[PDB]
Design a binder for this molecule. Structure first.
Ligand SMILES: Nc1nc2c(ncn2[C@@H]2O[C@@H]3COP(=O)(O)O[C@H]4[C@@H](O)[C@H](n5cnc6c(=O)[nH]c(N)nc65)O[C@@H]4COP(=O)(O)O[C@H]3[C@H]2O)c(=O)[nH]1
Ligand SMILES: Nc1nc2c(ncn2[C@@H]2O[C@@H]3COP(=O)(O)O[C@H]4[C@@H](O)[C@H](n5cnc6c(=O)[nH]c(N)nc65)O[C@@H]4COP(=O)(O)O[C@H]3[C@H]2O)c(=O)[nH]1
Ligand SMILES: Cc1cc2nc3c(=O)[nH]c(=O)nc-3n(C[C@H](O)[C@H](O)[C@H](O)COP(=O)(O)O)c2cc1C
Ligand SMILES: Cc1cc2nc3c(=O)[nH]c(=O)nc-3n(C[C@H](O)[C@H](O)[C@H](O)COP(=O)(O)O)c2cc1C
Lengths: 374, 372
């Protein structure tokens, strides 16, 4: 089956310039008997390749390409089935973009390529080609943010309580500063939030979720929360199926020595409106045209393998800029590797949550690891 | 009930400078007895104002502010209920950001304010750091543009269980029609709702798919040429038959069209795979999967000229789709004010009554924005 694969990479600037001649001749000779067509673009620092061929042929070729020491930071942009080949003849075609002016590069690409009966701009491949020629250095990883240049650097359980809480830091590595702490519910035997709520009866869950927060607040009050925010998780029903859950939380957090604005609530268009209204007037924080939260948390699945995914990179960069304009805090969660942190920081993330920095800590403030040079 | 209203606006650069000392002193004197507080930021070209008070007091005041000829392009950024007053004992006060070094404006704020965890402060910082981002450029002012017509021949085609209206998706910069959208009509020329209501519930998926033959037939004898064509389809109409994709193929080819010319606006993945293999394009009317086109909803387009939220969402949708290589169309564009602001955030393809009204079985008349 005919498949299109599009990736982007960059060279090592510290090493001798990559031999484009030897690269292209060997590529052309190897691609032809395998039925592989396409084009390679080079701007001095970055490569950009379109590959067309069978799924079997492209999976094999890309593995060799990924593992090639001539380039690094291989970022996959597109991988889809195709109805027709855009590129014809076959040497692997190559353009050194340093030799082309404005629209001369697009003109040479369009010389031998076919993009159907409609305008080439209607083809995703052509648009991606155009974006690299126009602004390829956009998602080019900066030298200070190369992963290889970085490396990484007590309290008891309480079984007698109906529930307990583990605290995880949300950190800002650039200023080596804790931004907030999130309270995460744990069972009396140390189990996860799933295990806890499964041991509670179905008709009792909402009320348990709300009343569990008293233990999180008490934990937060006994710990040195030096003007740090505390985030707590709540089911929509826990706030809604209660006469005054906002007022309940208010009385509970104030009795523990906390302020309204110090507490953030992490979470049905109908029931949420009058609840958020009361939470806002109380002074608590919440985490687009209808309403705006104080914080948006980029999920772990967008964070996972962000260094190789041009889609995930584009989405996260789009979230950062939008939230900046709206005045909404952004936190990337589920950060497990140096690579993820580097790439998330390159697209504008400054606040992080994950096992790389700080693991959840049962009934206390855990230790934080910070990324340092070399 | 305390509320916060934040907006940005722009000066008139070719008119005598507004006496801001007079305005702010008058503002401060009027605001405080009415329980209104806040600040004004000035960067030479733009205003940024935070207003605090009751919902009723701010509505009445902001209404006077919107109709004030001393400024233009008033764009609302925030209107939300508020826990506490941030600018207590400050009716109104101006900060000229040009008289401050970096951090200086923000530090002054914090000395008469009553930080980064607050939305208002982040927005203040955003205007201080890069206020000119959504500053509407001079050649894109609504009054520097006029719509002018470029004739429509609508026809009734009897002997058909359905009809189709065609609406152009246009590219004003190249004065070019990008594609035509097929919109289903009843035999009497009634709405899509009017058409589907005549069809029995169990036959609605079969009818939706098989009605496309008449859309293909219309596009072919037009002739379509080098232009695209949505068709819209229900997901169920694609599952209804195992060779639904193969049937659409046969139908468009028999109408003299190409696969790459046709765009369609669990279970779904297998169909998506079949649509790509065949060569047809797909639109949403992201990591798993990527369409060829996304269409910005009419609600986001409505009042985008006065909504900073909608401005921000659309801009980053545009930028995201640029990086993904996805075509972006703004739908429901009714006014020049909308077109100008969509153009300023990076939209280049447009659909709406401003440009082209849907035309029963034929290519309608198109209007273009021309510079003044
Ligand atoms: N794979 C990975 N995971 C990481 C990493 N860093 C942190 N996590 C984890 O992700 C969860 C916190 O994210 P959440 O979106 O608040 O998701 C939480 C949160 O929604 C939640 N939850 C916690 N406490 C409560 C509660 O009291 N009430 C309700 N309704 N939900 C709660 O249940 C969810 C599952 O929570 P947890 O088992 O405590 O697991 C925690 C946590 O340990 C990482 O680097 N990699
Ligand atoms: N207010 C306003 N409206 C504008 C403007 N410009 C275009 N429109 C309209 O918006 C509709 C096209 O948008 P759609 O999301 O495809 O929405 C369409 C489309 O989803 C649809 N539809 C049309 N044909 C079919 C079909 O064959 N099958 C299915 N399943 N749905 C269809 O039903 C919807 C109703 O379509 P229509 O009556 O044809 O109404 C058209 C159209 O007249 C504007 O500037 N302002
Ligand atoms: C940016 C770049 C593009 C490449 N393109 C191709 C190509 O399209 N075809 C190919 O066979 N090898 C290509 N390679 C080289 C492969 O990574 C690998 O070195 C080569 O295929 C090994 O083949 P061999 O066993 O004949 O030495 C490329 C390498 C780089 C750095
Ligand atoms: C940038 C801008 C900000 C303004 N802010 C206020 C204000 O905060 N309070 C106020 O009363 N008028 C403000 N005005 C002026 C009003 O639009 C309006 O002219 C005035 O309130 C009319 O009331 P008056 O007739 O009593 O002077 C502002 C005008 C502009 C251009």
């Amino acid at each position: 089956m005919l498949t299109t694969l599009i990736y982007r990479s960059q060279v090592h600037p510290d090493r001798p310039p990559v031999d484009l001649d030897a690269l292209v001749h060997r590529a052309s000779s190897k691609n032809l008997p395998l039925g592989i067509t396409g084009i390679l673009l080079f701007n001095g620092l970055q490569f950009f390749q379109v590959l067309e061929g069978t799924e079997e042929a492209l999976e094999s070729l890309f593995s060799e390409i990924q593992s090639d020491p001539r380039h690094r930071d291989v970022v996959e942009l597109m991988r889809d089935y195709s109805a027709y080949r855009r590129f014809h003849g076959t040497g692997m075609r190559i353009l050194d973009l340093r030799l082309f002016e404005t629209d001369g590069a697009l003109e040479e690409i369009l010389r031998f390529s076919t993009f159907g009966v409609t305008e080439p701009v209607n083809d995703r491949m052509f648009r991606l080609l155009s974006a690299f020629i126009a602004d390829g250095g956009r998602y080019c990883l900066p030298e200070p943010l190369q992963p290889s240049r970085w490396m990484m650097m007590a309290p008891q359980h309480l079984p007698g309580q109906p529930c307990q809480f583990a605290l995880q830091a949300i950190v800002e590595p650039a200023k080596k500063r804790v931004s907030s702490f999130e309270a995460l519910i744990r069972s009396p035997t140390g189990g996860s939030p799933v295990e806890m709520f499964a041991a509670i009866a179905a008709e009792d869950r909402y009320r348990f979720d709300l009343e569990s927060k008293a233990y999180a607040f008490a934990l937060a009050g006994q710990l040195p929360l030096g003007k740090h925010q505390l985030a707590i998780n709540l089911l929509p029903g826990s706030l809604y199926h209660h006469p005054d859950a906002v007022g309940w939380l208010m009385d509970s957090l104030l009795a523990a020595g906390l302020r309204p604005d110090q507490v953030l609530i992490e979470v049905c268009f109908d029931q949420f409106r009058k609840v958020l209204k009361a939470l806002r007037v109380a002074g608590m924080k919440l985490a687009l045209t209808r309403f705006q939260p104080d914080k948006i948390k980029v999920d772990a699945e967008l964070v996972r393998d962000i260094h190789i995914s041009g889609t995930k990179q584009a989405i996260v960069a789009s979230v950062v800029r939008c939230c900046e304009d709206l005045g909404i805090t952004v936190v990337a969660e589920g950060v497990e590797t140096l690579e993820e942190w580097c790439w998330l920081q390159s697209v504008g993330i400054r606040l992080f949550q994950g096992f790389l920095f700080s693991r959840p800590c049962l009934n206390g403030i855990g230790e934080i690891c910070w990324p340092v040079a070399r």
